[PDB]
């Protein structure tokens, strides 16, 4: 869980 990948995961 990184904060550049968020959409989906949160």
Request: hydrophobic fraction near 35%; avoid cysteine.
């Given at each position: 869980?990184?904060?550049?990948?968020?959409?989906?995961?949160a």
């Open positions: 869980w990184n904060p550049a990948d968020y959409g989906g995961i």
